[PDB]
């Protein structure tokens, strides 16, 4: 259809004007494809004849493109770049390089020839069909997601209105500038003291295990802290201008005001150094030191706020209790990063040698620390390797910020770095492994625990396949006191596989490893929806990844043919999905969700309709 429309537009443009510039003007393009096409064609007769051979046979189009670019690794890469409609979801440049190297290598010792490249391409099972062949805000779901964060902000702002009003009411006598100063002061009392508590990452790991994470957001703490910081830096400035306007009106000693100048300067230091520009530049120790002055802001303020010491006492005792409860070897282990693979789309894969007595459940995160990157920063990362894997511990660290970017870009320029992990934290997932026909649903980017969970499911499910050493009558034993599932679905819904190419390759690996067995029963079904690729024609970058993975583990297309038809574009149709889950009879379905709350309620509705036992796992 597009070829016919292109031909019609060319015929209309030809009748409207052939020079090289006119040809490019008709094509509405600078184009290396256009210049070589002219050089190989060198009139209306020539253009129509060339187009007819180019229009009226995909392999012929690819040969045409080959001769156009023919003027051999770097050139074939440009051919494949020309043969990809990079529209919504894309093939990462690392995977593109791998694909081009795989074609060029198996084809050929120097440059390749298009003739044998043709049969080399036909030899690839899935590269042909996936290479496109051509020449050239307001929703109820939004508020349903953000109602918890909005209620936290509203409680904060309401408490501030309460304190400001109660202070300005009592101090209504003093005129027009002690009201403002007293209101701002009564606010600062609470703002500082409780800007402390947001950083009890020894207590957030405990509150996150409970159901409280479902009601109040526990992952916004760092940026609620950066918000209390800004309100402090605003209210202290208003406090200071109020107390200097008051002294000016008094114009027309004590240790309260000079400590005030000291606090204003210390807060402007903690506010200038805490910007993004200080950690964006590779200064991760300079940020940490200048913030270490929150002690001096907390010291000067005790000698400033006559009643401040109570505020600072309760959260301050909490905070230093925690900072003391954590010492050098509390739960740390100076493990060694064994290998570091830089997966495509800027994600770092760390294999860190497992500590001997390091036992974790699947879906357990850990706080990672790498002194080469940042000496005092502890970021949390989900263990994306099943516990049954005994040698190493995986972590897939997607570049979402300044520390993780530093980790990647530091390894890219270059692997035994010094690493101090901090223990396994996580909700227990034994509800899953004690179930039947679980339906693991996951949405968005919170699926790194599903990597560990699916790998552990598959390890435990292959562990119950015994093979007799004598007569090799391999049978399948029943439940093994650890696992009970008769079936496991997994539905992954995400806008695109942007940083999760490792996850798509993981789902491909699980389907490869259990499609050689599906002839009698299929245990795991791995769905995938993309919700941004409008049509299956757009999900051709994932077909390329799967056909590329089929060549690291040399297998037949029938291994993936199950996953190819469950790798769908656009949103799901939950009616059909749950109804098919119901059509199978493998136990009592127990949906497990890990995603937003609007989708959580949609699924809870459909689930309690169909009679499944919904859950919402919070990992």
């Amino acid at each position: 259809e597009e070829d016919a429309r292109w031909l019609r537009w060319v015929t209309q443009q030809f009748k409207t004007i052939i020079s090289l510039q006119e040809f490019k003007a008709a094509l509405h393009v600078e184009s290396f494809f256009a210049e070589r096409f002219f050089a190989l064609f060198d009139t209306l007769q020539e253009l129509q004849e060339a187009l007819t051979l180019l229009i009226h046979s995909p392999m012929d189009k690819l040969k045409f493109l080959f001769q156009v670019y023919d003027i051999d690794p770097d050139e074939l890469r440009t051919v494949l770049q020309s043969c990809l409609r990079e529209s919504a979801i894309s093939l990462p440049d690392e995977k593109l390089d791998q694909l081009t190297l795989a074609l060029f290598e198996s084809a050929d010792n120097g440059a390749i020839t298009f003739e044998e490249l043709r049969d080399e391409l036909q030899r690839f099972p899935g590269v042909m069909e996936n290479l496109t062949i051509s020449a050239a805000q307001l929703t109820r779901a939004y508020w349903h997601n953000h109602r918890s964060q909005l209620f936290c902000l509203a409680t904060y702002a309401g408490l501030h209105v309460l304190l400001f009003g109660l202070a300005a009411s009592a101090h209504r006598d003093l005129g027009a500038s002690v009201m403002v100063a007293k209101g701002c002061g009564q606010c600062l009392n609470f703002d500082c003291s409780f800007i402390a508590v947001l950083m009890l990452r020894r207590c957030l790991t405990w509150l996150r295990a409970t159901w409280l994470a479902q009601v109040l957001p526990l992952d916004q703490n760092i940026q609620f802290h950066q918000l209390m910081g800004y309100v402090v830096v605003g209210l202290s400035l208003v406090h200071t201008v109020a107390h200097t306007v008051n002294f000016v009106l008094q114009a027309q000693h004590g240790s309260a005001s000079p400590t005030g100048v000291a606090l204003l300067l210390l807060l402007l230091l903690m506010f200038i150094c805490s910007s993004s520009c200080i950690r964006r530049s590779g200064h991760f120790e300079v940020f940490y030191w200048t913030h270490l002055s929150y002690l001096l802001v907390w010291l000067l303020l005790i000698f400033h706020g006559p009643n401040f010491w109570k505020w600072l006492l309760v959260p301050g005792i909490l905070f230093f209790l925690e900072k003391a409860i954590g010492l050098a070897v509390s739960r740390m282990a100076a493990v060694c990063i064994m290998e570091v693979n830089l997966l495509p789309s800027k994600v770092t894969h760390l294999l860190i040698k497992r500590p001997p007595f390091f036992h974790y459940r699947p879906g357990d995160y850990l706080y990672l620390n790498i002194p080469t990157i940042a000496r005092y920063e502890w970021h949390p990362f989900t263990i994306s390797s099943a516990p049954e894997q005994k040698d190493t511990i995986w972590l897939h660290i997607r570049s979402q910020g300044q520390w993780t970017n530093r980790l990647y870009e530091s390894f890219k320029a270059s692997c035994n770095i010094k690493c101090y992990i901090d223990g396994p934290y996580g909700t227990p997932t034994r509800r899953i492994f004690a179930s039947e026909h679980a339906v693991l649903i996951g949405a968005g980017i919170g699926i790194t625990p599903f990597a560990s969970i699916l790998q552990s499911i598959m390890y435990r499910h292959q562990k119950r396949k015994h093979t007799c050493p004598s007569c090799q009558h391999s049978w399948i034993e029943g439940v093994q006191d650890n696992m009970k599932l008769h079936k496991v679905d997994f539905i992954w819904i995400n806008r695109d596989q942007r940083s999760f190419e490792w996850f798509v390759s993981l789902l491909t690996k699980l389907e490869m490893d259990q499609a050689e067995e599906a002839q009698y029963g299929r245990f795991l079904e791995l769905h995938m929806y993309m919700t941004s690729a409008l049509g299956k024609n757009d999900m051709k970058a994932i077909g390329l990844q799967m056909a590329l993975d089929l060549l690291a583990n040399k297998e037949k297309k029938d291994s993936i043919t199950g996953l190819q038809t469950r790798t769908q574009p656009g949103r799901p149709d939950w009616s059909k999905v749950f109804q098919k889950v119901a059509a199978e009879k493998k136990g009592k379905v127990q949906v497990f969700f890990c995603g937003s709350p609007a989708l959580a309620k949609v699924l809870k509705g459909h689930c309690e309709k169909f009679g499944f036992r919904f859950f919402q796992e919070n990992f």
């Binding site: 690794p73 770097d74 390089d97 190297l101 060029f104 290598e105």
Partner: peptide, 13 residues
């Protein structure tokens, strides 16, 4: 460039 050296190393490997 970088990928040419990669192809050279792959052929040598």
């Amino acid at each position: 460039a970088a990928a040419a050296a990669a192809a050279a190393a792959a052929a040598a490997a």
